[PDB]
Every structure is written in C-alpha cells, then in structure tokens.
Design a protein around this nucleic acid. Sequence first.
RNA 1: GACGACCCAUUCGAACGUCUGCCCUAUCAACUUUCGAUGGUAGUCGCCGUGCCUACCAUGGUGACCACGGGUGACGGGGAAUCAGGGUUCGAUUCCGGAGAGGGAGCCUGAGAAACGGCUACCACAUCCAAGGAAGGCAGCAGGCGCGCAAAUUACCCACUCCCGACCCGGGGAGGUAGUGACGAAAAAUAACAAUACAGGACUCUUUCGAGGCCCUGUAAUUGGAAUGAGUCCACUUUAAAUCCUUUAACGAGGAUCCAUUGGAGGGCAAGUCUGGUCGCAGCAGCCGCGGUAAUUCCAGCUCCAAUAGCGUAUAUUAAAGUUGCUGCAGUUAAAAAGCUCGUAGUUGGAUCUUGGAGGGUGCGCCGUC
Lengths: 182, 263, 142, 126, 59
Amino acid sequence: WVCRKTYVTPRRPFEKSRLDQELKLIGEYGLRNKREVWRVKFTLAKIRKAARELLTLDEKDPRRLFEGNALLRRLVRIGVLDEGKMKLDYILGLKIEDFLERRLQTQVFKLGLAKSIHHARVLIRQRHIRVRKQVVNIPSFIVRLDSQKHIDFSLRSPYGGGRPGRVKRKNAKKGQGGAGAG
Amino acid sequence: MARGPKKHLKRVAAPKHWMLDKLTSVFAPRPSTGPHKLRECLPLIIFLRNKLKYALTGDEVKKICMQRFIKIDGKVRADITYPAGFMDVISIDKTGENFRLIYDTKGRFAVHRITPEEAKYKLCKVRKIFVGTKGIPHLVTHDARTIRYPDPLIKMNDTIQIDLETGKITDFIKFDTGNLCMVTGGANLGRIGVITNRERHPGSFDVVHVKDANGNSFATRLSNIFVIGKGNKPWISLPRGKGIRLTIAEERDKRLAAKQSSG
Amino acid sequence: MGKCRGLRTARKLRSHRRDQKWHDKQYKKAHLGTALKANPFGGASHAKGIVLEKVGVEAKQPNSAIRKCVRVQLIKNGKKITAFVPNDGCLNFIEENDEVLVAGFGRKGHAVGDIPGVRFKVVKVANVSLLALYKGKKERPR
Amino acid sequence: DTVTIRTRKFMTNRLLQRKQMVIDVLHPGKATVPKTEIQEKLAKMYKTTPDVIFVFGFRTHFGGGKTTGFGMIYDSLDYAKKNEPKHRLARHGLYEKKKTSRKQRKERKNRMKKVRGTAKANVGAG
Amino acid sequence: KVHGSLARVGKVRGQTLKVAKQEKKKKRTGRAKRRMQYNRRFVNVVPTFGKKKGPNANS
RNA sequence: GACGACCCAUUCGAACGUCUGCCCUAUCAACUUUCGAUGGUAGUCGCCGUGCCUACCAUGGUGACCACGGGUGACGGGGAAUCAGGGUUCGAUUCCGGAGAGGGAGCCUGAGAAACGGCUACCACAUCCAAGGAAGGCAGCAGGCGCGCAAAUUACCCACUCCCGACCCGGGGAGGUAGUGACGAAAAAUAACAAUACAGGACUCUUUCGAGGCCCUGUAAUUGGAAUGAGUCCACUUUAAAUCCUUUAACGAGGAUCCAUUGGAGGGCAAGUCUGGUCGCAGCAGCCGCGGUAAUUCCAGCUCCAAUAGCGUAUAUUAAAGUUGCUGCAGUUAAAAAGCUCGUAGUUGGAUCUUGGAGGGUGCGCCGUC
C-alpha cells in the first residue's frame, strides 16, 4: 500500500519570469496545467540530484560504476539522453524539454498523424492510437526508442478502418430514412 | 503473547528468501516443528506451489500431499508446512523428479533436480558428538538425525555421508585446511569455495577464511561453514553457478550478452 | 566563540544549549504544556460553545467602529470567551443561547487588528456556517 | 471473426491429473469470448473434450481484442471430480450444492449448545 | 465602553442595490483554456515596445 | 488401515543474566534498612540463578560523570514527516518487543495461563424476578449512548491467504469480499481539424503610394465533414456468488451545453491609475494600512489574475530561522561579561625518544593513455 507524490511546487509562487517560462512550455506542449509542468520540474530535480551524488563519487567505484552506467542506460532508452552525455558529466548540464519531448501528444503531431499538439491529446485520450498491439490513452506515455516506429492509429476507430463513427454512422442513416423512403 | 507458542506467521515477518509477495494475504505458512530451524527451512507448501508451480491453491498443495505423492529423505511426509531444508532430498514419484534443497548464490533454496541415484544419500554436518546412555556414543547432524556408534575419528564440524534408507553413515570428511565448502548463512550465504584459514577464538566465535575458484576471498562464522568435499570434488551436485558470486556489473554483462542475440 | 572547543566537552555544550533553549518562547510554551494548562481552546484547533450575550466592542484607534462579537461559554471547560462575528450583519445570524464553532484568529493566540481582547472567531451556527448563511446557500434553520 | 485460442506456458501436472496452462484469446476487434466457447474450442486442441478443460481467470486487455486467462484439462473425469475445487465443478452443469446462507446454521448450533448432550433435541427445535 | 449601538448593523449590504447576475460565455476546459491563455498572453502577445500596457485596463 | 509410554536429543519456544544507548526538571542535593537497605553464610522456596524468603553476622551500596525525588499531549523500537550539508520534529496506529481486558486481589486446569468469549471474593456498575432467588462484562466484529474538532455496514464468504482439530472433507467477524470513504496518493474528461471570412507581424517588390507573401492566431459566420466515455445497455468478463475496474453490439457532444470550481486584484503579492452604491458608516485589513462625497483596498457587477477536481480557512508542528546559531550567534553603546579575587569538580595542558618494473579495471585504431 506504499505510495509517493510525483510532483513538487516551486518555493515561491509569483516570479513573472518563471510563470512565462512555464506558459510557453504548456503551449508548445499541449500541456493542461502548471502541475503538468510542475510534475516535470519535479521529475527532473530528482534526476539531477541522483546525477549530482554520483558525480561526487570516485570513478571505478563499484557503487558509482554499477549505478551510474544504469542511470545512463535508463536515460538513453527513453531518448531523453545521448552518449557523450551518456556519462554523468553531461546529465548535469541537461533540461525539462528533453523529457517533455518524449510524451505521446507531441509525437502524434511530429509525424503529420495529428498536425497539432492539440489534436494529439484529444486523439490520444479518445482511443485512436496504439503503440503496436495496444491502445494507449495516456497523453501522458513516454515513447521508448525502438518503440517510436510502432505508434499508429488503432484497429478500429474509424481511421484505423472500421465502419464510420457513432456520429458519422448517425449521418449515414441521416440521408437514409428521409431521402431514400417513409 | 505471553503464555505460549506462536502458531501464526505474519507474512512480511516471514524469511525473505522464500520470496513470497507483499500483497496476497496477512500470513505466511510458518514451518511446523521439524528437522530444520524455522528461518532456515522451506515448508513444502512453498516448494509445491511457490517454486515448482505444481499447486495453485493451498487447498491443492494439501490434495497433492494426502495422495502421498511426495517424500522428503525417502519417507512420505504429509504436512503442508513441513520444514524441509539444506541437504534434504524431496522426491516426487509419479513425475520421476528428484530435487536436493541447496542454495542459490542469492541465498535462496534453489530448484535443483538430481539423478535417480544420489537421491539415495545426503551429506549432514556433524553438530555434536556424544557419549549417550549405556556408554554408547552418538553423532548429531544438522538435520537432527542421531546416529549411534560412529567412527571415532568423526569430530564436531566434520561432515558425514548418510545412506538414507537405512540411516547409516557411509563415510566422512574432516574439517581441515583446503576442504571444499558450502556457506549456509549470512552475507556470503551460497558461496562455495575451498578453505584457507580458521581463525580461532576462545570464548566464542571462530571465523573461516574461504577462497573461491576465482581467488575471491571472504570470511564467515564457523557456524556458517559446511564441508561438502574435496577441492574440485564436491560430494553432491552443485547448482548452476557453482556458488560463484558475481558483481552486479558482471551480472549485467552476462544478462545482456547471453540474450537478444547470442543463442 | 563563547563555548569550549574540547573534544571531550560534549556534555557542557549539550547542556548549555538545553539551558538556553528556554528563553525561546515557542520552545518553552511547548515544554510547559501551556496550551493544555492556560489556553481556552484545549490545545485543540476549534472549540464549540453557547452564546451568552452580544457585545459591540469599541475598535482601537486610530480606527473607529463597533466590532460585534459574542460572549461564549465553551462546553468543554465551561471557559468564558469572547469571539468575533465576521462579515456584514452576520451578528444577525447568531442569537443568545445559540451554540457556535469558534476558531483561532491565525495570530498565534494574539488578538487581531483593531479588535481589542478578542482572540477567536465564529465559524458555525445552525451548526450551519456563517458563510453559507451570509451568502444564503443555507438558512438559519429552525 | 475467426478468433484463435493460443495456450501458453504449458505444464503437464501428473500429481494433480491435469495439464495446466495460460489461455491467450485473440478476438482481434470486438470483444470477448464465452467461457463455454473457450472450453469447446480448447477441448479440440488437447484431444480431451469439454468436460475436462476447466477455464478461469480472465480479463480482456486494454482497448480490446484480446483476453488472457487460465485453463486446466483433466486426464480422468474422475481425477478432475476429485482434484477439482468444488465450486469449479458446480459452475458447469455437473456441480451444484446447498446454501444457507450460514448464520441460520450457526444459530441452530448455538441453540443446540444449551441442551445437554442429546442435541438431536436441538435439531428438532431448529 | 461598549454601551453604544448596533441599530446600523448591515446597513450597506442592505442598501447595496442588488445586481443581476447578466451572463454570458463558458470559459474553457483545462488544457484548452491554458492554451488560450498562452496564445493570448504570449502568441497574442506580440506586444509592442509601447513601454508596456495591461491586463485589466479600461481606456 | 484404525494412538500412548520412559529417557535422551531435536524444533517451536520460555524464564532469567551481560553491556551500551532514553524525555523534562535543582523553585528536587544528598539518598537507601528494624516491615532487607548493600554484603557474608546456611537453609527453606522456585524449572532454575538471586535477600526470593528466613535466621545469624557485618554495616553496607548510590550521588555534581545528576543519584534520590518529582513531572509527563512517554508504551519502547523498526520506522515517518521536514530535503544544502549539518540538522529539526514525530512515532498510539498494517511489523517486532512489552502491557491489559470494568477496578483490585486470588486460583484451578494443563507442557504452556496468574487467562477474564475460565472461575472466585471484594470494590464500582448494570440486569431479570412470581422478591425467595438468579444470571453479566464489545481497550473482539458490526451497531448504539455519552464525548467531542473529529472518524464507515446492525452487509456477503471460508473460494483466496493462512490457522486449528480426530481433520484432504469440519470450523474460523483471523482473514478475504462488497458498502461508506476528496486522510491522502496515481492516471486526467467537460471538446479536435479545415474552410470562407476577416484582424493582424518578421520576408520581398516599389522613390513613395500601393501590392505580393510565409508563419499563422484569434474572431465570427456558420459550415463542413472528421471524433470519444461520463451516462445508458443485449452479451461477456470478475469472483465463493456478485459489484466495480479492465470488455462491448444498440444509444450517448452545435452549446441555452452531457452547464468547473475556490480564493485574490492598494503594498508584501500574481491582478481594475473600473462602473453603480455608500462616506472613517457597513465593512476590509495576519502586518503596513484603506473608507471623513472624483474609494484602483469596501459592497456588488464587469473585467482580470492564480491554483484547477480541486481550492479556501483554523491548528499542532517543521522548513524559512545563522530569531537557539556543532557546522554556524550576539554581549563598549542595540536584549546580554558577576564589583573583585582565591578555588574543588569539570574542561584544558610546552618541546623531546624509527632514519622505472611489471598484475588488474575502459577509451582510442599489434600499439599504447589514465
């Protein structure tokens, strides 16, 4: 029954400069709320703290070696991070976009199959998107590397095939009952 | 509490090395009284339905046992929470399988099939060696088996090949510098290795410096050392891994290399 | 540096600190259990009582107003306490012999604003929330 | 739409007279499948017949067109009827049995306790 | 030192001529509303270097 | 195919014994024994060690390195919360150890109990009665009274998880299962895309006027095709049987919705150099301060901000607080060096004794670097 919080609010609350920054992030990133950003500012701070500790340790130090390499390999699987980075010295010099860039929502834009970070989120939350055998409704997801290619509309949502739409199918029978017969 | 013997085990307060999950219920099996101490044992139920996957329910484990399907050291055992342990045999017949309970390098009772022979005999570490009643002498092994009239060489900490149908020691190994060893508890639980040194303390606590087939050295308490034969010559099956112990990096190196390609 | 620096001198430093902690008012309050012993509310956060009478209290200079509190006997320890009645005409809503839920100012036990010797405020009557009453979400039930 | 019943992770389990395995049911694009359809369909892959292939677990996955469950098929209908959870046999037209629902019975027994031995006396009283 | 009155209690609330509610629009659901904010604020929002301006201004 | 026994070991334990670590307090400085306080010696007792008890015999044992005494929003710990680092605070409460079952005391049985879903007395409480009698203990599960700032069903099941018994089979308010459930934590709906239509800006062309143009955002005009569960619902799943989830045929989005909130907009502090009303009145205001007739603080709208299925308020406590300061405080004048010196504990103490070559980890194309 163990549980933990996933976000952290900023010490302080009114620093125009920070607020604007966050708003630009929501906009580019079809985000919903500040928490939506706060959640990531939080995710990142822990990663950076994880990193900083490690970087203070001796290199070759079974603890530093075994966990450093792991943090890196984890950070790379998600594309968040790259090789020269792909050492700890580079994660220290990293940022939020790099995570934010891997969510669904922005990808369904990023290859035509949405044309909007907008469209993207309503598409995702509405069941028209599988990551290869599996519908994924979590506009919040995190697309892994060799998983980038398997993202596509789903086997039945109409695009993806399958009749029309509880509203399109309404319209077909909308030209049927009246204009066909009585 | 405080008037009598506990009969329940809150799961979570059970021994880790059974690897029972956290959710499921409140209580773990809790080993019956038997030949092995409760921490250091493996209730059959965990074996039948937690390691071997023969059973799903506990209701099933029982249904299996009442058949008589299963013997420990040769002699049908019919209790769900029977406390089986190190050097025990376990034989399911109408299935043809013989397993010896001996450790992982994790320190987990390992699922270790043994031949249809071997299943005959087990190696017990002498715990005490005794002049019993009427002037007879006896040895006592870890697994709580008392054998009278043993041969006079046998001394505490030596190990001893028991027949098994008959009881009957059918030889022995002395504890001396250079013997092969199995580690039966503590940080090093599961590591196998030669010896090197026994540091001796009066009052209490003797340590055994062990060296593995990789020139990896480590200590434990004498209490934790079990003799299993002569270097390169175990007197039993060893599980895959030869109780080696590999660094978490070495462990990763093996895991990714053996597969996603390498057959 | 007013404080030995000997490897040994843990006990002197440890104890000298124990001795000076007292002057901290928050600390002393806590160790003397003042909240249990002096305070009208138990050492609790809220407290309910009966209204004795309605007071129009004379707000301190340079401000000038009639304040509008009730005097309340707390059921828990028969303690007599005056409590402010906030918002416009809300007295209206509390009558003599009423019941009421009182709460602290948010001042740490120190009276608020111009309102003199009043350290508590009404929150509920009609068991019923001055706010919900003032708005007219809910009424003076009866 | 065809389906396809796929049986993963097989174990031949003699000491409980049955072959036990996961059931992986594709149903591409609708949902579902009946327990009865599943036992019929399995009955014909393991050369056994329906009344020896109990089936249980089950949860269609996320989004549609698959369902993973669990099955057992018994070597003797006798062996099943005896190794069997009773509630399982009851579920299909071969096992059913008595209810209560439980506190009526406990009440009966507690009434019986008052009465010295005899107790049958208490039976006629309940 | 109290004496005095309350006759006047609630004089302004009761004298403040009530106002309709009027009405109009719904403002937008979560993230969409955040989006309108970001475009109105930042895209919109081009700004001039007019030495600034405001959010809740009249003339 | 249906258990006893003696003695020994074993297993689960038990009972005691070692040290080392605990809150506040000196407006608690000497304490402990003639009803043993500390020790000898012997016995009786106990499962057994032991002033356990008792005789005799000694006169001990403890304290400024805080004993003794008193207090306590003290059950103890694993743990929890607060994150520079140091720290700061909590811990009844899913585990461990300890304690109790109205208060006190005693006891039977049994290997194990000083047991209360045993008993027994008194003491406090309550109940039945044909008035002599008689029967009882929810700090078990539900529920109810009282109490209060505060806390759920008089529901289903032994299928799971395990336990017990003569036991595969029975029994389990252990425990699971549903109901209540914004402690609190996770996922995150209440609407996406063109088009006209327009409103616009970097780009280009032009002497200018003027025109083109990419990137697009709105904003209507309605369109236009493009959509999904929230509800509802054959069927099916879940499971002991159900529910819900996770599953879906048939339905379910043109806004007046299938209708999002709660605080703020004078300073700190994010946001009205508003409009009506009042005129130091009502109110606002943690603090500073507003309102005494052009109120950007009120009262309302309008409009805007902030956090958003949550948000305000009160309170314990923590961070901030280097305002308890080890790390890392101040004390001439701001709050603070005793009038001065001796001085035990405590703390604190000068100098000086012995003088490349290769093995293994990961980078770079047999070579090497670190």
